[PDB]
């Protein structure tokens, strides 16, 4: 035994063979209880799955052989031995994840498997409580994964009862200093969705509006966090989440009645939500059109064009093509547009000058310009000259289509 | 009647060992970028020569 401890000091690299040999000695000496607790300690201490498999298998077969030998005959020992045998058979999944809880303790995916293996939700709460303390936010690898743990933990209460408990838990969640911001969206979007089904969307706005308290000097805070290298929490640039702005806007836009008007409170609030997104430069081309279509559906068409003009310069010319198409298609054909013909021509000439200055295929704008010029004044000669400008200015198939239309019209 | 329980336990344990050993042997997309992302992407991925121009270019290469 003393020599055993000496090699435990001297050779730590082959611990598996050491523990197996000492276990064999314990079995040979009749120290079955010693074998039991020694194997338990070693099994808890394993770290690599190949090592775990050998010790777990040896423990399982030792229990099997000892129980069968005692059965060959004592009652209490046999009862305890087959009880441990059945326990080790069943607890394989628990030991399986016990290995992964030591390979990387803060990898939250394993905690989301350990919860799944628990028998009852009364235990799922306990495992979530352990997981929250064991996990440290600074080392969570995959972004947006710890937030899923708080989201699931709150949902666990929310499914049964005690909505107050879920809310008070979640208020603790947002206080955790997360390194990444996907973890924060996963909590706010879930909390707002769960409140929407219960307390109405009036409350559901408040949950997201607390997250989007825009601070002064956004550039300074975004610089501090971006250049902080995980040192600064994502709590301070929460305003810079596109997914929270998108869901907040979805809730506002779905809450606006289809017959809303400028004096309605929700319609004004949606305007401020969109204008603040544009000011923050979080507007995406699909959202810049979503805003313009919201305004057009509410008969505020003349202010729809201000959206297009506020947003077109920000994007690269390749995307300016799509927004220019939308802008001109709405301007030329819509009963509420008050643009004079010289204004619509000014828009068209601006679009063609800017886009053709960057080589973007402008066939559709040229065709729309020719059609508009035929519509508004009836000057066919000017319409043809516009098409010829398109064909004469590398997109060879488009220039062949403009040559066929220009010539056929002439 | 512990014999039947032992038999069932051994049957389950064989499968547990087999599974453990098997685990042991392993030993339109562009319309959604924000303006900020466009600024980042657009900054990360944006005959004859006079002797004075060639000189400056050679200096820069050096």
């Amino acid at each position: 035994e003393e020599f055993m401890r000496q090699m435990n000091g001297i050779y730590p690299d082959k611990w598996l063979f050491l523990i197996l040999s000492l276990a064999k000695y314990y079995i040979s000496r009749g120290r079955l209880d010693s074998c039991g607790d020694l194997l338990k300690k070693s099994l808890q201490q394993t770290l690599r799955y190949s090592d775990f498999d050998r010790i777990y298998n040896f423990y399982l077969l030792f229990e099997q052989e000892c129980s069968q030998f005692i059965l060959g005959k004592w009652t209490e020992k046999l009862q305890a031995h087959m009880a441990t045998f059945e326990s080790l058979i069943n607890l394989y999944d628990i030991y399986l994840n016990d290995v992964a809880l030591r390979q990387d303790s803060n990898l939250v995916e394993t905690w989301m498997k350990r919860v799944s293996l628990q028998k009852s939700a009364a235990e799922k709460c306990n495992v979530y409580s352990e997981a929250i303390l064991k996990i440290d936010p600074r080392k969570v690898g995959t972004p947006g994964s710890f937030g899923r743990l708080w989201c699931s933990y709150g949902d666990l209460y929310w499914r049964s009862n005690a909505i107050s408990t879920a809310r008070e838990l979640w208020t603790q969640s947002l206080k955790v200093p997360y390194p990444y911001i996907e973890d924060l969206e996963e909590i706010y979007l879930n909390w707002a969705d769960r409140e929407l089904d219960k307390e109405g969307v009036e409350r559901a706005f408040s949950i997201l509006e607390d997250a989007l308290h825009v601070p002064t000097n956004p550039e300074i805070l975004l610089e501090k966090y971006k250049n902080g290298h995980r040192k600064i929490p994502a709590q301070t640039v929460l305003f810079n989440s596109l997914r929270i702005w998108s869901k907040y806007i979805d809730y506002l836009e779905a809450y606006c009645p289809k017959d809303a008007n400028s004096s309605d409170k929700i319609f004004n609030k949606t305007k401020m939500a969109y204008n603040t997104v544009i000011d923050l430069r979080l507007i995406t081309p699909a959202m810049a059109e979503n805003f313009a279509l919201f305004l057009q559906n509410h008969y505020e068409v003349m202010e729809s064009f201000q959206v297009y003009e506020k947003t077109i310069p920000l994007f690269p010319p390749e995307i300016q093509y799509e927004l220019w198409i939308e802008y001109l298609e709405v301007a030329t054909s819509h009963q509420l547009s008050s643009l004079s013909p010289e204004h619509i021509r000014f828009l068209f000439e601006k679009a063609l000058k800017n886009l053709c200055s960057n080589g973007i295929d402008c066939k559709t704008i040229f065709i729309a310009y020719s059609v508009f010029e035929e519509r508004i004044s009836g000057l066919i000669s000017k319409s043809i000259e516009i098409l010829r400008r398109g064909a004469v200015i590398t997109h060879l198939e488009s220039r062949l289509q403009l040559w066929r239309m220009c010539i056929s019209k002439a | 009647k512990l014999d039947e329980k032992l038999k069932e336990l051994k049957r389950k344990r064989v499968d547990v060992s087999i599974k453990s050993r098997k685990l042991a042997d392993r030993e339109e997309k562009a319309f959604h970028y924000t303006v900020q992302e466009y600024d980042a992407w657009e900054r990360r991925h944006p005959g004859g020569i006079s002797y004075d121009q060639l000189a400056k270019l050679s200096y820069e290469k050096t």
Binding site: L196, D197, V201, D250, Y251, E253, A254, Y255, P285, A286, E289, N290, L293, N297, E322, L323, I325, E326, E329 | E28, F31
Partner: peptide, 24 residues
């Protein structure tokens, strides 16, 4: 139309699913 208005019309149609939960 085909590029962005086509997507946005789908967005205004998906919001009917949110409107169901809005009223209920």
């Amino acid at each position: 139309m085909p590029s962005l208005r086509d997507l946005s019309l789908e967005r205004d149609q998906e919001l009917n699913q949110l409107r169901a939960r809005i009223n209920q």
